[PDB]
Design a protein around this ligand. Structure first.
Ligand code: CLA
Ligand code: CLA
Ligand code: CLA
Ligand code: CLA
Ligand code: CLA
Ligand code: LMG
Ligand code: LHG
Ligand code: KC2
Ligand code: II0
Ligand code: II0
Ligand code: II0
Ligand code: LMT
Lengths: 42, 181, 174, 194, 154, 161
């Protein structure tokens, strides 16, 4: 793959948007399968 | 014998329709320059040669076994435990249930684990320089000069014929639904 | 250099005729993987335990010590193990053989160091290995009989697991 | 200069045929991004866990520790049935093994700080089975291949335990095929949820 | 440049001890190969760990069979806990902490034997095959190969 | 119980919350036919509401007079799953992010041009760093004690006062 396109995907806004979308995506998936977690269950 | 250039040799094609491959040299026994798909170029020749001879020996034993059972020739008391039918498929299923096939499987597998795999690996690695298919088994001789040429070629050709025959025999029995002879 | 026992296979490159019971038989190359001295000690430990087991199966079929017929039932071979664990017979045999094998662990480590031949516990109360010829000859007899005894022990116990008869009684019947 | 594993791709750098199982397989070029020492440490670690995990699934099918808490033939049920104190004991013991065996060089910045440190060599040879130098090439190859195979096999067995609520050997011996009425893949967004 | 996951601290600008120990090839039976103190392997190596493991295994056999075995009028003997053995001089501590406190097999219902496990609580070995063959089976057994055969004949 | 609160499993106000929350959805379900996609969606919402209240009742949460769960965060171990344990999970992740970012800014200072490494991130090196965070309490405490976390006061720019 092109090194300049990979250096573009390494830029701060792309990584910030991808990382916070990935972060948002596993918060969404964890709240989908295991919803209503007001507490650590113990 | 070896008879290089006539059979088991360079410049020898059983079928001229398929061209003689450069990758197939004349060193291996029963080499008739038959390699349309050109496996000889990328395969390990020692492995495929040893595999060929083992398939041949299994097939020749298979042909003799199918012939004896199809003829109804049996060892004493064997018909009582195993299937009375002379169908090879029926006998095999009955032999599995008796445990005869399991005992044969156990010992054949044991030989392959303790002897077949070391011999194969050492031939391929270069530890013993074993000729493919050699298992040092000449109880009644017949080896030496005869083994190098005619016997090696006779075993490879008869075994190829047996492999084809056993294949034919089982599919004949399947489509017909009745055993041969 | 090709194997005497398996002629199409190579010499196993860790075995030499100065060993007892050598026939060039290591087709699977286990001797390369693990120390030969350990394997020699292990072979001899397997050989001597199975030899005692083989003689035990035979003798247990022949006669039985006074009183033992009560504690055991009609059980024989492995069958007696579950009941003689209830009484302290197997417990005491385990304790004293375990006690010997703690020293056997120290002896095996000495063998790994090379300060002792494998299986050489110097045990010669009666005199048999005074002569050198007899010593090597009896070491070869010990190893061959032991390997046979191990095979026999497998045969006797599996004959019990099939028929329940025991060695002598499987000879007498069937 | 092409790969032998994938003949139409270029042979990847940091793959020079020195390592065991180095058949030239790195299409995605992770070795060009991630140092091959870390990747081989991680490959050996995944495979060794998976070799035990595959053996674990099959052996737990055959043999159990005694007691009712260890009587789960199906392996995914053993996760829940096994005593929690002991499973967390296993987890803590694994963490201790990781800190001592890696010698407090655990991160991607300080493992292999010692130039003597070799990928996968944690100093684990209790019975000195690698004392023979000749077997080292074969053993390292056969460890890598056994590891890869066990990664593929354990992954299969887990996902076959999910699909068919059956342990792997008795799923092979009491095989019932996939009906497709249930176990449909995906579908969370096709029906718009629910 | 940094390779990425290289693990050399200087590449990632992480503080490094710099003192990188040489790796001795010596190995102990229940320990790992690693940098060790001078004379450590000779004193506490394979010989030590194997002997101490052996001694611990021998010492385990009384420990597994720990209990007050008292013979009655008849030859039969009764196994009681060592907690029953009251101690005279420790005031309100009449029952005393004992070897069973350190090895509580009975509390957990293990029932230890000199060889580990035991009649009560022994290894459970079961046949997954369930007494049927690999192929050519009836309704009770449908193997994977039977599914291949059923797929072929349909 | 604690602070004059009642366990949510026996409070009547939590039960009337669950009953009212299910009645709101059942009256929305009463205007749809059985197999239709809105009815199926509404029934799954009812199932989720019942599961939430059922789980909360058996969790050891304490409800108020209003029938809503209340969190006790004074440190008591019978209620540590509401703040102390979720807080420990947070501090582990937060210290992970902090240690990983600090390690990356210290790497980026030793670069040929330090400020390109912060707008164009060296992703293999930064992923090496995100893997470093799992043992941050030990890594950061050894960093602290070895004089590598805290810089002395005479290496920091300050205003004249
Ligand atoms: C290597 C192959 C082989 C050989 C040489 C034998 C040889 C023999 N079998 Mg046979 N047998 C075989 C394989 C073989 N078996 C196999 C594979 C099975 C298992 C399926 C059996 C099952 C079997 C049974 C069940 C019996 C024998 C018996 C016998 C003996 C009786 C011979 C006799 O009186 O003539 C008989 C001649 C005729 C009937 C021809 C008329 C003989 C030694 C008998 C025995 O135990 O006697 C000692 C007996 O009852 N055999
Ligand atoms: C299980 C116990 C056992 C053990 C530990 C050994 C160990 C040994 N044997 Mg003996 N042997 C045994 C059983 C055993 N044998 C039996 C039952 C037979 C058949 C009669 C033989 C026949 C035999 C011969 C003929 C020779 C040996 C030799 C050897 C040595 C070389 C390494 C080897 O063969 O592989 C180690 C083998 C094992 C660890 C057992 C197999 C384990 C498999 C993988 C299943 C697990 C080693 C000292 C050779 C030697 O030079 O001896 C001094 C030799 O020439 N053995
Ligand atoms: C673990 C094995 C075992 C067991 C359970 C017994 C059990 C018993 N023995 Mg025997 N005994 C044993 C080994 C054993 N003995 C051995 C190795 C010897 C040495 C040869 C003896 C010699 C012996 C004698 C001489 C006598 C007993 C007697 C008795 C019984 C006592 C009443 C008792 C049932 C007595 C008895 O009742 O004999 C029938 C008796 O007189 N025992
Ligand atoms: C600090 C030491 C310590 C102590 C005091 C305990 C105490 C306990 N453990 Mg834990 N445990 C420990 C360390 C410890 N454990 C470690 C380090 C591990 C990880 C390897 C475990 C893994 C573990 C499991 C998985 C289980 C326990 C269980 C138990 C309890 C019942 C014990 C019993 O009945 O024993 C008497 C029983 C025995 C002595 C039987 C031993 C069984 C064999 C030896 C297991 C085979 C070992 C196997 C080959 C492992 C090899 C790997 C290892 C070398 C790394 C008891 C509370 C059990 C429990 O909670 O049950 C309620 C349980 O399920 N423990
Ligand atoms: C602002 C005031 C304040 C502060 C700072 C704390 C702080 C703390 N309380 Mg207290 N508490 C307070 C007010 C306060 N409480 C009030 C008003 C009440 C109502 C009566 C309680 C009732 C209460 C109970 C009932 C308990 C605590 C406990 C704790 C500790 C929580 C876990 C811990 O570190 O244990 C120490 C654990 C570690 C250091 C490591 C564990 C991993 C912590 C020191 C718990 C405790 O541990 O008591 C000491 C406890 O059981 N608190
Ligand atoms: C020092 C160690 C010494 C150890 C010695 C023992 C180990 C030696 C090595 C052994 C290696 C394994 C050998 C087998 C051991 C068990 C033997 C046994 O009885 O097995 C047991 C089982 C059969 O089990 C049988 O069950 C019957 C009742 O149903 C009988 O009554 C008996 O119980 C038993 O014989 O064997 C199998 O299932 C084999 C399946 C087929 C395996 C391959 C067969 C040969 C290759 C041809 C196949 C071609 C297929 C083409 C595609 C077809 C697609 C449909
Ligand atoms: C090296 C390891 C190799 C792993 C190989 C993976 C094997 C399993 C992969 C899927 C198998 C077949 C899928 C059919 C199943 C399938 O396609 O279902 C379809 C599903 C979407 O639902 P639909 O719109 O299809 O609904 C269709 C209707 O017919 C039913 O309502 O697609 C997905 O988004 C599900 C996958 C989650 C996507 C995100 C995954 C998690 C992201 C993690 C980061 C990226 C990882 C890779 C992402 C691709
Ligand atoms: C009388 C006191 C005592 C007892 C009762 C005892 C019992 C056992 C048992 C019993 C079941 C085993 C299995 C065992 C095994 C090991 N012991 Mg031993 N041991 C005792 C004393 C010491 C000392 C003073 C040292 C030591 C060591 C090791 C090492 C590691 C070597 C290494 O990995 O290189 C191993 C494997 C050295 C050390 O490094 O410990 C981390 C070390 O200096 N031991 N030890
Ligand atoms: C070389 C070459 C090529 C080629 C080629 C070709 C044509 C290859 C063909 C290969 C064949 C035909 C192999 C057949 C093997 C059969 C065997 C070994 C027998 C098994 C039976 C057993 C063991 C049994 C049994 C039994 C006994 C006795 C008793 C019974 O009661 C039961 C039972 C039946 C179970 C190609 C074209 C690809 C290109 C290449 O460039 C060059
Ligand atoms: C670290 C890492 C890796 C890894 C790894 C992994 C995943 C390792 C997993 C290891 C495991 C599973 C260890 C399990 C230990 C089990 C024990 C001790 C059982 C004890 C039973 C007891 C005490 C009992 C009892 C009794 C009770 C109470 C009551 C009865 O009714 C029941 C019973 C009679 C049984 C590797 C090595 C691959 C590589 C690399 O280096 C990185
Ligand atoms: C190194 C070292 C030593 C050691 C050691 C150890 C612990 C050695 C252990 C090594 C092990 C446990 C190797 C196990 C490999 C398992 C594999 C490859 C399974 C693959 C499964 C597959 C492909 C599958 C599948 C399947 C699918 C999905 C469908 C299923 O329905 C069924 C099926 C099962 C067929 C010791 C300690 C002795 C000391 C020495 O000094 C140093
Ligand atoms: C000799 C010990 C040397 C180090 C000891 C220090 C221990 C460190 C913390 C120990 C924590 C104990 O961990 C705790 O104990 C046991 C372990 O199975 C578990 O207890 C569980 O199993 C036991 C054993 O049958 C049951 O009797 C008990 O009812 C059940 O709750 C607890 O659920 C677990 O929380």
């Amino acid at each position: 793959m092109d090194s300049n396109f990979l250096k573009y995907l390494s830029t701060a806004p792309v990584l910030f948007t991808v990382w916070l979308s990935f972060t948002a995506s596993f918060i969404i998936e964890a709240n989908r399968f295991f919803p209503d977690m007001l507490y650590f269950p113990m | 014998l070896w008879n290089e250039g006539k059979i088991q040799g360079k410049g020898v094609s059983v079928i001229p329709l398929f061209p003689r491959p450069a990758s197939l040299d004349g060193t291996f026994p029963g080499d008739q320059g038959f390699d349309p798909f050109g496996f000889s170029s990328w395969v390990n020749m020692k492995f495929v040669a040893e595999a060929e001879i083992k398939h041949c020996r299994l097939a020749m034993l298979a042909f003799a076994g199918i012939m004896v059972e199809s003829a109804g020739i049996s060892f004493p008391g064997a018909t009582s435990v195993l299937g009375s039918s002379k169908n090879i498929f029926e006998i095999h299923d009955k032999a599995v249930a008796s445990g005869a096939m399991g005992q044969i499987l156990l010992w054949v597998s044991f030989f392959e684990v303790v002897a077949g795999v070391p011999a194969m690996n050492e031939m391929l690695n270069g530890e013993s320089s074993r000729i493919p298919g050699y298992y040092a088994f000449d109880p009644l001789g017949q080896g030496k000069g005869d083994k190098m040429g005619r016997m090696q070629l006779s075993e490879i050709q008869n075994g190829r014929l047996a492999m084809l025959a056993v294949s034919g025999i089982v599919h004949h029995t399947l489509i017909t639904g009745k055993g041969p002879l | 250099a090709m194997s005497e026992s398996v002629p199409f296979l190579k010499k196993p490159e860790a075995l030499d005729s100065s060993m007892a019971g050598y026939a060039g038989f290591d087709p699977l190359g286990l001797s390369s993987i693990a120390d030969i001295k350990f394997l020699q000690e292990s072979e001899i430990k397997h050989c001597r335990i199975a030899m005692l087991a083989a003689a035990g199966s035979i003798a247990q079929d022949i006669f039985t010590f006074p009183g033992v017929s009560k504690v055991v039932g009609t059980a024989k071979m492995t069958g007696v193990h579950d009941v003689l664990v209830k009484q302290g017979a197997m417990g005491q045999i385990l304790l004293w053989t375990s006690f010997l094998e703690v020293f056997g662990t120290i002896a095996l480590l000495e063998t790994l160091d090379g300060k002792r031949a494998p299986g050489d516990f110097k045990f010669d109360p009666l005199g048999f290995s005074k002569n050198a010829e007899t010593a090597k000859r009896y070491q070869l007899s010990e190893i061959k009989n032991g390997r046979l005894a191990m095979l026999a022990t497998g045969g006797m116990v599996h004959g019990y697991f099939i028929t329940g008869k025991g060695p002598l009684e499987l000879l007498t019947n069937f | 200069a092409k790969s032998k594993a994938v003949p139409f791709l270029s042979q990847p750098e940091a793959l020079d045929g020195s390592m065991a199982g180095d058949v030239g397989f790195d299409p995605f070029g992770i070795s060009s991004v991630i140092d091959i020492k870390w990747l081989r440490e991680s490959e050996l670690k995944h495979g060794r866990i998976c070799m035990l995990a595959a053996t674990g699934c099959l052996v737990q099918e055959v043999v159990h520790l005694p007691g009712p808490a260890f009587s789960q033939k199906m392996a995914l049920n053993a996760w829940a049935a096994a005593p929690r104190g002991g499973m967390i004991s296993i987890l803590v013991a694994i963490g201790l093994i990781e800190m001592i065996s890696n010698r407090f060089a655990l991160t991607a910045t300080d493992m292999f700080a010692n130039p003597n440190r070799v990928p996968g060599d944690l100093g684990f040879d209790p019975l000195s089975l690698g004392a023979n130098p000749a077997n080292r090439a074969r053993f390292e190859l056969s460890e890598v291949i056994h590891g890869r195979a066990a990664m593929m096999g354990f992954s299969g067995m887990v996902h076959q335990m999910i699909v068919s609520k059956q342990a792997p050997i008795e799923q092979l011996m009491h095989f019932k095929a996939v009906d497709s009425s249930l176990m449909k893949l995906g579908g969370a967004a096709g029906n718009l949820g629910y | 440049d940094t390779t990425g996951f290289s693990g050399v601290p200087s590449q990632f600008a992480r503080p490094e001890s710099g003192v990188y120990p040489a790796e001795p090839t010596e190995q102990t039976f229940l320990g790992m190969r690693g940098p060790r103190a001078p004379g450590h392997r000779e004193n506490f190596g394979g010989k030590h760990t194997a002997t101490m493991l052996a001694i611990a295994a021998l010492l385990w056999q009384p420990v597994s069979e720990a209990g007050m075995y008292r013979m009655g009028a008849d030859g039969a003997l009764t196994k009681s806990s060592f907690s029953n053995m009251e101690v005279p001089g420790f005031g309100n501590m009449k029952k005393a902490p004992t070897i069973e406190s350190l090895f509580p097999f009975a509390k957990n219902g293990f029932d230890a034997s000199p060889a580990l496990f035991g009649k009560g609580s022994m290894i459970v070995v079961e046949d997954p095959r369930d007494g049927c063959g690999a192929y050519a089976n009836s309704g009770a057994c449908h193997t994977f190969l039977d599914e291949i055969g059923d797929a072929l004949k349909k | 119980d604690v602070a004059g609160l009642t366990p949510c499993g026996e409070s009547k106000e939590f039960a009337r919350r669950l009953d009212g929350s299910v009645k709101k959805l059942q009256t929305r379900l009463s205007k749809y036919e059985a197999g239709t996609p809105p009815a199926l969606a509404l029934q799954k919402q009812i199932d989720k509401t019942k599961n939430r209240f059922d789980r909360y009742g058996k969790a050891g949460l304490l409800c108020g007079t209003d029938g809503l769960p209340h969190l006790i965060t004074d440190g008591r171990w019978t209620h540590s799953g509401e703040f102390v344990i979720p807080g420990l999970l947070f501090l582990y992740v937060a210290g992970w992010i902090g240690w990983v970012g600090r390690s990356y800014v210290l790497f980026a200072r030793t670069a040929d041009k330090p400020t390109e490494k912060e707008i164009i991130i060296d992703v293999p090196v930064a992923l090496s760093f995100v893997s470093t965070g799992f043992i941050w309490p030990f890594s950061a405490f050894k960093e602290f004690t070895s004089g590598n976390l805290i810089v002395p006061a005479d290496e920091i720019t300050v205003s004249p006062r």
